[PDB]
């Protein structure tokens, strides 16, 4: 379909979820469509993960345009409710996006993660 940087590779997806979970414990992660778009417009973001199986996909199709412009990688998981309870909020997040700081092993993990995404491209 349109979700062309699809990530179905299982160990890849599991690493993405776990990194999100770690980042959720580090408060460096924004939960939801609207907030994702705010974070990327303000540029602070460094990676963005979406969900393929939303019913009108179009409510997240606006993100890849902006991230192609402002040059940050984005990648789709296949399961929204998995992403949601990966954040740990009990309601199916459709869009999570996690940003940078100065000195963090989490920042390192992010860099390796976006390298994996650029591999998937």
């Amino acid at each position: 379909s349109a979700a062309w940087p699809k990530a179905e590779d299982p160990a890849l997806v599991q690493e993405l979820l776990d990194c999100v979970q770690q980042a959720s414990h580090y408060r460096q992660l924004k939960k939801g469509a609207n907030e994702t778009t705010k974070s990327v417009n303000r540029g602070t973001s460094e990676l963005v993960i979406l969900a393929a199986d939303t019913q009108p996909l179009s409510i997240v199709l606006h993100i890849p345009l902006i991230c192609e412009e402002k040059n940050v990688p984005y990648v789709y998981v296949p399961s929204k409710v998995a992403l949601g309870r990966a954040c740990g909020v009990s309601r199916a997040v459709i869009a999570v996006s996690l940003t940078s700081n100065e000195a963090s092993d989490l920042n390192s993990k992010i860099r390796a993660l976006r390298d994996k995404v650029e591999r998937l491209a």
């Binding site: 609207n34 705010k38 417009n41 009108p56 179009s58 199709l61 606006h62």
Partner: protein
């Protein structure tokens, strides 16, 4: 002649708006949607906004004053004169402001990206705005009918 010209102009505006973005004019109405698109510059220029941007779309001086000096933020922009929020009340008006914000952002991305197989009736095309209309008007009638606070019923004596 000028008056009639404006009248038929508004007729065109509503029709052409139904032609472009049926979801949004199924939510709010062509005029306020037009004002939004105007301040947007373009449809996609709108659809890259987030929900909170749409909630306060317009009130730019007021917003940036209250932020740049840490005052209370404005609650809404053109959505105030939009049709649905007039039937709320006060604290309800704020809650409707948020909810109408997010569902508008939904509808705009929907009409702005979701393709249609072009043998597509307008109703099947605008079903999502219709859904939003229904759910949201239900929620508005609920919060309107939120009860009040039971107080102990006094009789004649203090008893």
């Amino acid at each position: 002649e000028r008056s009639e010209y404006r009248r038929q102009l508004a007729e065109y505006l509503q029709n052409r708006m139904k032609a472009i973005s049926p979801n949004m004019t199924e939510l709010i109405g062509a005029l306020v949607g037009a004002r939004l698109i105007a301040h947007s510059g373009s449809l996609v220029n709108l659809a890259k906004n987030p929900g909170s941007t749409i909630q306060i779309l317009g009130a730019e001086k007021a917003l940036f004053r209250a932020l740049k000096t840490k005052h209370a933020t404005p609650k809404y922009g053109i959505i105030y004169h939009a049709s649905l929020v007039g039937q709320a009340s006060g604290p309800n008006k704020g809650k409707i402001a948020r909810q109408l914000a997010a569902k508008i952002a939904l509808s705009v991305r929907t009409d702005a990206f979701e393709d249609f197989p072009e043998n597509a009736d307008d109703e099947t095309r605008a079903a999502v705005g219709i859904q939003a209309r229904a759910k949201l008007e239900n929620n508005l009638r609920l919060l309107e009918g939120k009860p009040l606070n039971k107080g102990v019923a006094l009789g004649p004596n203090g008893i």
